[PDB]
Amino acid sequence: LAPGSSRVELFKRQSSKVPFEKDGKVTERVVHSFRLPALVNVDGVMVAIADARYETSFDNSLIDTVAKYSVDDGETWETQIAIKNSRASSVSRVVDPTVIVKGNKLYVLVGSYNSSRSYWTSHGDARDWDILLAVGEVTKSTAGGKITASIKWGSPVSLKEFFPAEMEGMHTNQFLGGAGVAIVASNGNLVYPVQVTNKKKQVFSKIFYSEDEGKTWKFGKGRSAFGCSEPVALEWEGKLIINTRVDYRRRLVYESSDMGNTWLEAVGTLSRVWGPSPKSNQPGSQSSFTAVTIEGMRVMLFTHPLNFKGRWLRDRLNLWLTDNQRIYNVGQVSIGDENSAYSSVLYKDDKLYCLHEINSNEVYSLVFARLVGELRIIKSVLQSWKNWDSHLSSICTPACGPAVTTVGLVGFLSHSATKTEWEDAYRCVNASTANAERVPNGLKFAGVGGGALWPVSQQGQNQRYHFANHAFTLVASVTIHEVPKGASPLLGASLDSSGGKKLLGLSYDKRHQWQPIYGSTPVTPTGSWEMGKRYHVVLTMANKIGSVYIDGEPLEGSGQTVVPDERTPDISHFYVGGYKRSGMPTDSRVTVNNVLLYNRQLNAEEIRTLFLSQDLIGTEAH
Ligand SMILES: CC(=O)N[C@H]1[C@H]([C@H](O)[C@H](O)CO)OC(C(=O)O)=C[C@@H]1O
């Protein structure tokens, strides 16, 4: 939890009571565990929705959906049960409550089970399952000079009639919402990303939506891959971005421009960025994933536990900020090494809040945190992005010519640097350095082991540059200070840790020729360069094809396959001005300035503009 931030235990395990209704009688009952937080703002009223697991935190036990609400931004709350289970058995339950806010209404989607003690995806059929929608109506009043609010919950309605018996290539079994908070699309549709099973017990995600305020429901034709559960979605630039949990694998993210009719993996932005554990080989988690506007910039906030402990412990709840280009690690929301899996982040009246789980010995509470420090950090970072984007866009390029493009600009290494790091102007991913001397807008390297390393898969659990495996443009200005003994590296994308296995790179040789390297293709030296002269270098990769440009012109060999149509590359890092490896035999004596990383292949005009504007883009004077 960041400095300045604070929290309270709002839903207190084995302490907090809820009004338990049974057989026409209501009694204040102590709840064992509270899980699956959903925190929203309804017309000024804060509402926290969750599971009230009365007797145990076991998934298949007695559960009602509880709600707490506040009209004073979380200082005091009123408590109620929003949805009660069927009361058919000692393990009847309404589960995975998923919330949509529209106007003054709360739409809550829950699975309902009567008596099964087995985990839902293990069920061979749907005999024990129903899917329900309850609507809560929020009213505000001022009886007494003070703001008050009340929420009237309606009876749940089964949506089972809207679940087709078959979907493309399968027979349906059950479905549930993805928990947390879903959305109202810009066209007014209620949209729930849902997790669905078929009769083969496979799980996948779908879009489940309503065009008539929840009276009838439809499924989008498309789907995620199998294995994608607990989806959470938001709308961004006209598309739904569906962010899925994949147990024991990296999280898959999809985009859909047609209400789920077609799904495309977001390989160029967010897919496979977030891992569920350091080695991405443990169970995943529910995630808060929202689009908000902070100081005029539309951005996305995403949470997920780091899970250093493994299994479902899911310690270290972390918060991420992204504009669909850069991906910033705001930091750890939870405290110390506590288990803290599920969460819900709310941005209301320029204040940031998070309702999240804490778990000790499988007894769960929900803490309500005021994320003061986090918002401060977020605002600073967004200012930096807006500022550098503004700076680059404002440059009068030589004939003013076309503007330098910032669309897809993810990283920028320029003037800022410490003894051992080259700092990302966008503040997301620094490069490590060796044998580097600071110069205006860059670094001058020399000696065996010299260079800088801008990590890709080397980022570890969370891989912000995963997009580079699909497409990228890497740009830099370079100057060679000594003729090498053989062939020496200048810039490239490495597939392994050494730099010996390259995806695409540029070297230079003793005969004053360039050596562009295209994957494992035999190298053909070409062109010519002279010592002390500055050159503009661009490496592009898209559709498995690599190109290398010098001074805005493509070199011989460009347009070559760098990826066997077989697999998808797993780039380790970009190397700059050397390999940064004392064990590699080369000595690169060169200066590199203004390294730009884009998440797409730049077009000819964009490359020319960068070439012509080399002397104008540095961060030095700012
Ligand atoms: C119906 C059910 O068992 N829901 C469980 C959910 C489920 O496994 C799936 O991943 C998304 O609902 O996951 C988790 C979990 O802590 O990992 C808690 C829920 O109790």
Residue 240 belongs to a domain with what CATH number?
2.120.10.10
- Residues 154/159/161/166 CA torsion (nearest 10 deg): 180
Structure tokens at 261: 């009719």
Which of 51, 53, 59, 132 has most ligand 1 atoms within 8 Å of CB, for mutation? 59
| Burial degree of 161 (CB within 10 A; 0-12, 13-18, 19+) | exposed
- One domain for residues 356 and 380: no
| Burial degree of 319 (CB within 10 A; 0-12, 13-18, 19+) | buried
3-state secondary structure 261-296: CCCEECCCCCCCCECCCCCCCCCCCCCCEEEEEECC
Gaps in the chain (C to N distance exceeding 2.5 A) after? 399
Which of 286, 314, 366 has most ligand 1 atoms within 8 Å of CB, for mutation? 286
Buried b or exposed e, range 364-380, using 16+ CB within 10 angstroms: bbbbbbbbbbbbebbee
Return d(Cα 271, Cα 269) in angstroms, integer.
6
In the chain, the number of structural domains is: 2
Return d(Cα 514, Cα 235) in angstroms, integer.
46
DSSP 569: -
- One domain for residues 83 and 178: yes
- One domain for residues 66 and 177: yes
Nearest to 308 by CA among 329, 338, 343: 338
Q: Measure 190 CA to ligand 1 centroid, in angstroms.
A: 23
- One domain for residues 262 and 410: no
- One domain for residues 127 and 153: yes
- Residues 430/436/437/438 CA torsion (nearest 10 deg): -10
Is 166 strand, coil or helix?
A: strand
Q: Spell out the alpha helix ranges (H) of 289-371.
A: none
Q: Spell out the alpha helix ranges (H) of 310-358.
A: none
| Cβ proximity of 419 and 430 under 8 Å | no
The pocket around ligand 1, CB under 6 angstroms, is made up of 59, 95-96, 111, 119-120, 176, 179, 229-230, 312, 341
Q: Measure 341 CA to ligand 1 centroid, in angstroms.
A: 11
Is 608 strand, coil or helix?
A: helix
- One domain for residues 415 and 287: no
| Cβ proximity of 151 and 67 under 8 Å | yes
- Max distance between CA atoms of the chain, in angstroms, equals 92
User: For atom 2 of ligand 1, which residue has the closest CA?
Assistant: 59
Is 95 strand, coil or helix?
A: strand
Domain holding 415, by residue range, is: 371-622
Residue 345 main-chain phi, psi, to 5 deg: -105, 130
- One domain for residues 458 and 529: yes
- One domain for residues 470 and 525: yes
- One domain for residues 200 and 102: yes
β-pair type (228-236, 239-246)? antiparallel
- Residues 116/117/120/124 CA torsion (nearest 10 deg): -60
Structure tokens at 449: 């082991």
- One domain for residues 397 and 299: no
Return d(Cα 446, Cα 434) in angstroms, integer.
9
- One domain for residues 362 and 415: no
Return d(Cα 216, Cα 199) in angstroms, integer.
25
Vertex 476, ends 473 and 481: CA angle to 5°? 145
264-265, strands of its sheet edge to edge: 228-236, 239-246, 253-256, 264-265
| Cβ proximity of 488 and 499 under 8 Å | no
Domain boundary among 335, 370, 405: 370
Structure tokens at 376: 């401060």
Residues forming a β-bridge with 66: 50, 81
Residue 41 CA, chain-centre distance (Å), reads: 22
| Cβ proximity of 31 and 17 under 8 Å | yes
Return d(Cα 233, Cα 242) in angstroms, integer.
4
Count CB atoms within 10 A of the CB of residue 261: 12
User: For atom 20 of ligand 1, which residue has the closest CA?
Assistant: 59
Count CB atoms within 10 A of the CB of residue 258: 13
| Burial degree of 327 (CB within 10 A; 0-12, 13-18, 19+) | buried
Ligand 1 atom index nearest CA of 247: 10
Which of 53, 54, 96, 123 has most ligand 1 atoms within 8 Å of CB, for mutation? 96
Domain boundary among 326, 344, 370: 370
Ligand 1 atom index nearest CA of 113: 1
- One domain for residues 274 and 206: yes
Q: Measure 365 CA to ligand 1 centroid, in angstroms.
A: 16
User: For atom 11 of ligand 1, which residue has the closest CA?
Assistant: 230
Count CB atoms within 10 A of the CB of residue 436: 27
- CATH code at position 438: 2.60.120.200
DSSP 379: H
Domain boundary among 350, 370, 390: 370
Q: What's the distance, Cα to Cα, between the start and end of the chain in Å? A: 31
